[PDB]
Amino acid sequence: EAKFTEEKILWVKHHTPKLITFAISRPESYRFKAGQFSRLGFYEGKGFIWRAYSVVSAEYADTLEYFAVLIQDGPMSALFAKMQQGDTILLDKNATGFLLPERFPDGKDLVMLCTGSGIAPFLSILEQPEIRQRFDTVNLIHSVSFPEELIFNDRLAALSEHSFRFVPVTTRAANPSGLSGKRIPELLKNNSIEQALHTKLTPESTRFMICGNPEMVKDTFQTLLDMGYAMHRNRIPGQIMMENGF
Ligand SMILES: Cc1cc2nc3c(=O)[nH]c(=O)nc-3n(C[C@H](O)[C@H](O)[C@H](O)COP(=O)(O)OP(=O)(O)OC[C@H]3O[C@@H](n4cnc5c(N)ncnc54)[C@H](O)[C@@H]3O)c2cc1C
Numbered sequence: 001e002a003k004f005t006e007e008k009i010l011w012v013k014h015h016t017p018k019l020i021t022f023a024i025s026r027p028e029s030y031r032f033k034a035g036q037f038s039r040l041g042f043y044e045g046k047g048f049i050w051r052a053y054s055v056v057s058a059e060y061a062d063t064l065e066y067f068a069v070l071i072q073d074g075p076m077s078a079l080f081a082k083m084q085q086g087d088t089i090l091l092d093k094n095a096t097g098f099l100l101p102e103r104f105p106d107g108k109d110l111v112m113l114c115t116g117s118g119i120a121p122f123l124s125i126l127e128q129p130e131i132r133q134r135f136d137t138v139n140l141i142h143s144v145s146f147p148e149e150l151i152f153n154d155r156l157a158a159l160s161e162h163s164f165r166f167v168p169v170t171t172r173a174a175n176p177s178g179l180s181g182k183r184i185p186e187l188l189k190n191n192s193i194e195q196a197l198h199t200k201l202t203p204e205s206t207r208f209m210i211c212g213n214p215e216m217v218k219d220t221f222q223t224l225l226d227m228g229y230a231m232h233r234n235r236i237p238g239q240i241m242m243e244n245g246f
């Protein structure tokens, strides 16, 4: 039939005036791999409006959960800001994306680097039991401007205490637990991330995922290349995978 189904908003949590999570009903035949994104839409008059969102919830969960930054004057943000439980929302029948760490042949330490809402796919990746089994450590570095935007801080930090480490980065204000004042590319360059994790990072043992602001992705990729890392390819195992968070 159609390329999408009509689902319902099950709930909406307004963590801050600009940051929301929400959940939608999940058709039994909707399958995705941790790290992928859905396309969500609404009827817009006689037409549609569609956007991509990384699935935050686990592959095995019975709902679909998402995490959205409300963009000033954004068309989809405007709908998200007024949507309520019970509203109809459209779910494209197909999930997409290549942020798939199991494609890495080996590696001792998985390091996921994200900004803002780009944390979303890594939250779903964190639920896959085999990811934790194949990596000696799994690390998540999350960069936001202010600590109030670290909305998953409480539980990620609870999961950190085969090890899992969470390092918050706040670029425009201090945060006690993690790194403050500096963006991820510089924190890779000056050894701060390597020191924060207590794990030496090398091309031989470290595998990188990057998701977030496109300028951050380019800057991080360039920094890693200068440090001897390589892009994962169809025929080269490599040590870097990346996806623009928007
Ligand atoms: C593969 C992919 C995955 C995505 N996953 C998510 C997700 O999990 N969560 C999410 O919030 N958005 C996600 N986005 C972006 C999302 O699809 C929309 O762009 C976003 O919801 C804003 O839509 P809008 O209509 O309100 O404004 P738009 O017209 O779509 O965007 C206006 C501008 O706002 C900025 N912007 C848009 N989205 C973001 C963002 N999330 N963070 C920072 N700046 C942004 C950009 O400069 C953009 O040009 C993803 C985009 C892609 C391509």
Ligand SMILES: NC(=O)c1ccc[n+]([C@@H]2O[C@H](COP(=O)([O-])OP(=O)(O)OC[C@H]3O[C@@H](n4cnc5c(N)ncnc54)[C@H](OP(=O)(O)O)[C@@H]3O)[C@@H](O)[C@H]2O)c1
Residues within 6 Å of the ligand: 069, 071, 072, 115, 116, 117, 143, 144, 145, 169, 170, 171, 172, 183, 184, 185, 213, 215, 216, 217, 219, 220
């Ligand atoms: N949050 C911001 O600082 C900021 C700035 C300009 C516009 N906006 C707008 O505000 C809305 C919300 O955005 P957001 O804060 O969720 O997303 P964001 O602008 O992408 O910021 C999230 C994180 O990404 C970092 N970052 C940005 N560019 C980077 C780069 N080139 N290299 C490395 N790290 C980089 C930011 O550092 P910094 O804090 O140092 O930028 C911040 O830590 C969007 O409409 C966005 O366009 C936000």
